[PDB]
Design an enzyme around this catalytic site. Structure first.
Site, PDB file in Angstrom:
ATOM      1  CB  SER A   1      -0.854   0.075   1.194  1.00  0.00           C
ATOM      2  OG  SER A   1      -2.367   1.046   0.733  1.00  0.00           O
ATOM      3  N   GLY A   2       1.682   0.809   0.321  1.00  0.00           N
ATOM      4  CA  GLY A   2       2.737   2.174   0.835  1.00  0.00           C
ATOM      5  C   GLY A   2       4.058   2.168  -0.107  1.00  0.00           C
TER       6      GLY A   2
ATOM      7  N   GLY B   1       0.793  -6.408  -3.969  1.00  0.00           N
ATOM      8  CA  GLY B   1       1.379  -7.809  -3.818  1.00  0.00           C
ATOM      9  C   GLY B   1       0.812  -7.949  -2.429  1.00  0.00           C
TER      10      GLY B   1
ATOM     11  CD  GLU C   1      -0.240  -4.772   2.129  1.00  0.00           C
ATOM     12  OE1 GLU C   1      -0.594  -4.669   1.083  1.00  0.00           O
ATOM     13  OE2 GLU C   1       0.339  -4.272   2.859  1.00  0.00           O
TER      14      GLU C   1
ATOM     15  CB  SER D   1      -3.550   4.291  -1.370  1.00  0.00           C
ATOM     16  OG  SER D   1      -2.384   3.005  -1.614  1.00  0.00           O
ATOM     17  CB  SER D   2      -3.275   2.591  -6.435  1.00  0.00           C
ATOM     18  OG  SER D   2      -3.636   3.135  -7.853  1.00  0.00           O
TER      19      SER D   2
ATOM     20  CG  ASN E   1       0.289   7.135  -0.811  1.00  0.00           C
ATOM     21  OD1 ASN E   1       0.018   7.764  -0.529  1.00  0.00           O
ATOM     22  ND2 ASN E   1       0.407   6.302  -2.340  1.00  0.00           N
TER      23      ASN E   1
ATOM     24  CB  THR F   1      -0.430   5.676  -8.775  1.00  0.00           C
ATOM     25  OG1 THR F   1      -0.280   4.548  -6.745  1.00  0.00           O
ATOM     26  CG2 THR F   1      -1.200   5.238  -9.361  1.00  0.00           C
TER      27      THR F   1
END
Lengths: 372, 643, 372
Positions: free
Chosen positions: B79-80, B364, B366, B141-142, B138, B84
């Site tokens: 996530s972080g 990915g 997680e 975040s995407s 983030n 993107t």
């Protein structure tokens, strides 16, 4: 707390397992002592193929499995299937990991030396419990009623016993076992109730005869002039409503079922009955201890719960005992869990810590260590 | 761990680990994306230049024209990690180094709607308003995955693009954690830079009026909702959307807010739900081109079709609130999907295409103490992606030993993972059992569970019954993925997987005055034929039977596109949860490394002949050793040289 | 999608075929289960000589062909003529090529082992389908009503059945078959309507008695004081206009026709009726499962569509069942396609993929493979 919270108490029976944490007032887990093995290949919706079933899932699904009882008459007869019931108890019923909990187990009255060593071998070597202890069942029942000398009439699902105990040591040569208990008793009611002109045809009819036995059965005192009473037909009768409407009536047979415990002749048994056996245990003991045993007849077990069991036993042994004697039949209300509660007390006790068999004792002394 | 760390404390964010291109979040600004660099990395093998993303990105291009094969770039991280950002940055790269619309190049509204190179670009900022949000990790975040196909021409100049979206976080639309927030759009719009909008949508500027969107946070300091609103706005236009559509989008995005304001009450002496007012419904109704009443009925007295007819069913208060939420989400999603399509549509040119370069951005593997359905879907995606690599490497490796003449035999490295994959995707595997039970009108999560076991337990190795304790929250089933053991909780699956929607309402949508809204629903309206009576199979009429039935189909269409490609890998990393440049928590980076594939690439390397030098990367660094004879070798034949 | 779109569902009946794609809500194709063979040599204008006719072209042209029904009472009796109906279904009705579509088929309740193997032999060896599967009809009907345990009263054109199902397994020894259905029922109406003083003389008179049965027939509750009602002559009567003007009136007989399903004696049948048979199935099952079956009487089939069928059945079995029981007669609106819809659901399902019998299974295991 380390183990104050942490001690487990597992009472293995012929019909039911009672389990929970030392400290609690009653068993956290109570369930049938069965292990079902599916007769056919297939699945329930959403589940995978299951090799085995234990407790209530084995009872509920009994039509597609071959049911087996690991404990015949209080003794463990199949060790593959018992390790299965233990596994279920720890992991599913109490949901604990066993390798951090001391485990107090119970065994039967003249449990073969080799068995007490085998369940120790399985407790320590396949479940890896920190420490364990095996108490004798009548002995925990007595102790849960406060005392240390008395004689326990213990009666559950497959066995009845009389275990005279003196300052804690159960007396091997005076113990009596009568293989007629609540299981035998449900099947006899069954016949005197079909014989009343009925049919327990589907499995939903079979199972509930046992719930009739528990709810409506009685042990009358003067079972003689109770049959006589039945005939004049008083408002002694009692109708139970089945899974559906089918209101079945049971007047009389209601007490003809526990009269089986005093008269085994009702069921083609030639053995003596509960009260005579209490007594015979007692005239097999030392002379000087017989006043003690007589004033301390402690009752435990599911089948000793029939109301008026104590009054009948009271009068049954007064009238066999020398009149110079004091008779006293203690029957507590929680008696279907006496055994368990006695274990809960004992194992949560402040002084018991020094009798726990630890893996240190075991890895160093072999199964012999706990065997005593 | 230590190498990464050292070159980071020195401010080097790009370090390679085999084929990978590790990237660490700077957490500050760098002259790297520098317009000088872009050129520098232009026409250079990765041995002629230091570790950097443009290396990967250029080589792709090169390779693209050199080998006449299509390419791919797989960006992945938590996530972080900041993917993107990279993705975008890669994209610019392509656009720059191979554009030339000739006419579109002039400084006259350059990059505005009316050119792609721009459209291509402009794409992002729209999607981002709708599929991005402030995560606790983030700030942008995407909340979805993506795959772009940049279709290069014959010459080598840009020709087309292609987006595809995967797994959108539908839940944000209705929920939000305490430190997070929903999609930007909402906050963009209520920012007030375009006041008409507020009156047009019939809302206020205070988000606390819209429960759905202010459960968490409303404002983020690093974001200027006002600026974005335009960015967004302008992008729409460039993207070629009709004003009307551009109007639908807005109007539709507000309806959704309103829905969450829709309130109900128990009818007296009845357990039925009855509308608690026609204040909001009115707005939602109008904004969607609906009728207030018809709407509230359908909602309250859902008219179903059990048997061969249509049986009117009554709902509870709790049932409504939940159904509403289901549409809110449903609608948003679809829309989002549509926007993408529409984008794609503009991004469609007539010019010939010979090859493309796929840029894949997804999450990915997680691991959470709590792993639900969504986790499985993602993990599964990754465990596949991994095998995809392990193989490419096996293929690759084996060429060297063939080129050199070494005698090394070895089995495909992918193979190790086939076990796990089969268990999930194969016929009597998880998904199936999952998607079958979804057909049983009276199945339970519990039901499903048992079916899962009876069939896989004891018989399957990768299949296991959970470890309920540690940092985990409950028990159901663990799997043995390459990265490790994941403890999965099966609760809601059945539902989530059924995508239950009140068909009466959908009906209304289907006949809206707002064409766009009408459109979005069409595909539901065309499969109803197929699931006419109670029980049965939705697919008969083209309706989804599984929540998972597509995911798979899409994931296949993808992994297939990935094959006719020359895979190029990029692994994005996140230094410290605390957001500090030049720092790194160990175990945190360590984690990523395992789940990344980095540690597995090292393994496979070490089996054997660990360190493996790329030829140019070999020349440069060591020419100096027999300077005359090694330089000649390296220059004379990029490979023959090192030799 | 490969097969998400691609699964076919074909429900073979005694009167109608129902067919279509798994996924759809209702059958794409519904047509008579006939195969006509021309009695004379000749042609229609513009066509060639046709050896055979199937479905509606066989019905429409019945005057020059000998009509034959391949499925007698739900069981396939002629395999040459069945392969003809399948061929027609794939190639003309659904217009698909079968060799790229998985095919879910249905069979009847106690369908002979050998038949399930034979239609598998014909599906894989003469139609070359990728994969197939045979579901039992009552079982798909139940499942389409959401549940897994219940008892289905299934009634179509040539057979009626009761199939008690428990957690998905249809119970072989409790299944009952009553050979009186909608076909029998149209012919009885026919006579009580000619007996009302009428004539169904030409074939355009014959066919429409069946459309009278479907549109105007009723199952009255208290069929007793409904005849009594008929006599006082209320506005209970109902006139239907024939292909032409000839307005025929049907007041009373309207319900005398479905009273045949409860009283087979109306038609010289000595067998028991629908409600008694529901019940007898149920007192043939295990005891513990009888409360489940009683609260889940699912109805499916064209002949169970007569309005008020459910209310009559509701009261028919309440009054035979023990009052302690919960009765519950589920009759959904789409019931003339329950079977099919249950197949559409199941075959489009996410978990069914692993039960499809593939040509790999077949070419390797013989017809035995799918037979289970």
């Amino acid at each position: 707390d380390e183990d104050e919270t942490t001690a487990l108490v597992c009472d293995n029976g012929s019909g039911l397992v009672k389990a929970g944490f030392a400290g609690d007032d009653a068993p956290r887990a109570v369930f049938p002592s069965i292990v079902g093995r599916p007769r056919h290949q297939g699945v329930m919706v959403g589940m995978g193929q299951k090799d085995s079933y234990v407790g209530d899932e084995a009872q509920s699904k009994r039509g597609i499995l071959t049911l087996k009882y690991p404990i015949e008459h209080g003794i463990i007869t199949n060790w593959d299937d018992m390790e299965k019931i233990w596994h279920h108890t720890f992991y599913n019923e109490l949901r604990v990991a066993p390798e951090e909990h001391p485990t107090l187990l119970t065994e039967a009255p003249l449990n073969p030396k080799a068995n007490r060593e085998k369940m120790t071998q399985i407790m320590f070597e396949t479940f890896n419990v920190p420490a364990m202890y095996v108490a004798i069942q009548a002995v925990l029942s007595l102790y849960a009623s406060g005392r240390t000398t008395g004689i326990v009439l213990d009666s559950g699902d497959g066995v009845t016993h009389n275990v005279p105990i003196y300052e804690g040591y159960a007396l091997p040569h005076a113990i009596m076992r009568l293989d007629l208990a609540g299981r035998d008793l449900t099947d006899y009611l069954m016949k005197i109730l079909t014989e009343r002109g009925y049919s327990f045809v589907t499995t939903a009819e079979r199972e509930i005869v046992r719930d009739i036995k528990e709810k409506l059965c009685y042990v009358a005192l003067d079972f003689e002039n109770e049959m006589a009473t039945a005939a004049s037909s008083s408002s002694l009768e009692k109708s139970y409503e089945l899974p559906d409407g089918q209101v079945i009536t049971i007047g009389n047979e209601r007490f003809r079922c526990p009269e089986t415990l005093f008269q085994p002749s009702f069921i083609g048994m030639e053995s003596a009955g509960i009260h005579e056996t209490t007594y015979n245990s007692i005239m097999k003991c030392d002379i000087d201890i017989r006043k003690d045993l007589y004033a301390n007849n402690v009752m435990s077990g599911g089948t000793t719960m029939y109301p008026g069991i104590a009054d009948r036993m009271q009068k049954e042994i007064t009238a066999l005992a020398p009149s110079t004697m004091k008779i006293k039949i203690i029957a507590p209300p929680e008696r279907k869990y006496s055994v368990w509660i006695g274990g809960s007390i004992l194992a949560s006790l402040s002084t018991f810590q020094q009798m726990w068999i630890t893996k240190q004792e075991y890895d160093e002394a072999g199964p012999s260590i706990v065997h005593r | 761990l230590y190498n990464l760390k050292e070159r980071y404390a020195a401010w080097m964010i790009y370090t390679y680990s085999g084929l990978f291109c590790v990237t660490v979040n700077p957490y500050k600004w760098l002259p790297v994306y520098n317009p000088k660099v872009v050129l520098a990395y232009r026409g250079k093998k990765r041995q002629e230049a230091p570790p950097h993303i443009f290396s990967i990105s250029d080589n792709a291009y090169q390779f693209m024209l050199t080998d006449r094969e299509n390419q791919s770039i797989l960006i992945t991280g938590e996530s972080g990690a900041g993917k993107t950002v990279n993705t975008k940055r890669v994209i610019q790269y392509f656009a720059t180094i191979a554009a030339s619309g000739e006419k579109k190049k002039e400084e006259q509204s350059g990059k505005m709607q009316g050119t792609l190179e721009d459209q291509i670009i402009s794409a992002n900022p729209l999607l981002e308003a709708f599929g991005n949000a402030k995560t606790v990790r983030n700030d942008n975040s995407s909340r979805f995955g993506k795959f772009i196909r940049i279709h290069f021409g014959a010459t080598g100049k840009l020709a087309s693009a292609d987006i595809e979206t995967y797994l959108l976080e539908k839940s944000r639309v209705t929920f939000q954690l305490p430190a997070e927030r929903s999609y930007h759009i909402f906050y963009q719009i209520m920012s007030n830079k375009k006041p008409e909008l507020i009156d047009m949508l019939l809302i206020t500027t205070n988000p606390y009026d819209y429960h759905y969107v202010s459960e968490g946070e409303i404002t983020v300091p690093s974001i200027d909702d006002q600026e974005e609103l335009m960015a967004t706005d302008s992008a729409i236009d460039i993207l070629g959307f009709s004003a009307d559509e551009k109007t639908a989008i807005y109007k539709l995005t507000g309806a959704v807010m309103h829905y969450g304001n829709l309130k109900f009450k128990q009818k007296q002496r009845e357990e039925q739900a009855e509308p608690d007012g026609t204040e909001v419904a009115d707005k939602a109704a109008y904004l969607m081109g609906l009728n207030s009443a018809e709407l509230l009925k359908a909602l309250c007295y859902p008219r179903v079709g059990v048997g061969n007819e249509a049986v009117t069913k009554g709902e509870t208060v709790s049932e409504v609130h939940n159904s509403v939420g289901a549409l809110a989400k449903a609608v948003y999603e679809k829309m989002f999907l549509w926007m993408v399509i529409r984008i794609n549509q503009q991004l469609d040119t007539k010019q010939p295409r010979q090859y493309f370069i796929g840029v894949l951005d997804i999450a990915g593997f997680e691991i959470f103490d709590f792993n639900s359905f969504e986790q499985l879907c993602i993990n599964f995606t990754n465990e596949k992606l991994q095998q995809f690599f392990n193989h490419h490497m096996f293929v690759l490796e084996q060429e060297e030993y063939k080129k050199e003449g070494i005698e090394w035999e070895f089995i495909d490295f992918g193979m190790d993972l086939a076990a796990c994959i089969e268990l999930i995707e194969k016929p009597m595997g998880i998904f199936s059992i999952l998607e079958e039970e979804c057909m049983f009108p009276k199945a339970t999560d519990t039901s499903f569970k048992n079916k899962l076991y009876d069939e896989h337990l004891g018989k399957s190795n990768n299949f296991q019954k959970p470890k309920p304790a540690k940092g985990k929250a409950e028990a159901h089933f663990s799997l043995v993925h390459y990265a490790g053991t994941v403890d999965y909780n099966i609760s809601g699956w059945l539902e989530k997987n059924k995508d239950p929607l009140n068909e009466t309402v959908i009906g209304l949508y289907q006949k809206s005055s707002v064409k766009t809204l009408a459109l979005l629903f069409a595909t539901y309206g065309g499969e109803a034929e197929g699931g006419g009576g109670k029980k049965g199979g939705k697919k008969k009429g083209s309706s989804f039977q599984t929540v998972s039935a597509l995911f798979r189909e899409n994931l296949n269409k993808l992994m297939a596109n990935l094959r006719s490609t020359h895979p190029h890998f990029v692994r994005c990393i996140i230094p410290n949860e605390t957001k500090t440049p030049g720092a790194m928590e160990h175990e945190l980076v360590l984690h990523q490394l395992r789940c990344n594939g980095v540690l597995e690439g090292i393994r496979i390397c070490r089996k054997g002949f660990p360190s493996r030098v790329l030829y140019a990367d070999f020349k440069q660094r060591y020419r100096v050793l027999n300077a005359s004879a090694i330089p000649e070798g390296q220059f004379m034949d990029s490979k023959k040289a090192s030799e």
